């Protein structure tokens, strides 16, 4: 169990760092953070019934 804990922390945190790097790259790619926030509002809208 301890072995699994120590291995899980590293595997999970590596996956997180990949995620954050990809997010910031997405912002810089699309333009302003707020523009990607607007498209995020539209996608959240399509995700609800609105």
């Amino acid at each position: 169990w301890a072995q699994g804990r120590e291995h899980v922390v590293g595997v999970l945190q590596a996956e997180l760092e990949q995620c954050q790097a990809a997010m910031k790259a997405l912002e810089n790619s699309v333009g302003g953070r707020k523009k990607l926030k607007e498209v995020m509002s539209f996608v959240d809208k399509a995700r609800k019934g609105e």
Partner: protein
């Protein structure tokens, strides 16, 4: 910069409607500059004669 889109949805972080509004804004800008320029020309000395 290039976009290669016939109807661009999101480029540089801007929505499809935002792009249309930006083009409309540029048209209005250019027409405003031309209009002011022609006003200054109509008030110019060269148009008095």
């Amino acid at each position: 910069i290039i976009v290669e889109g016939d109807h661009p949805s999101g480029a540089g972080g801007f929505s499809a409607a935002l792009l249309a509004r930006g083009r409309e804004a540029v048209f209005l800008r250019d027409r405003a500059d031309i209009l002011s320029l022609r006003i200054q020309a109509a008030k110019s000395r060269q148009c008095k004669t």
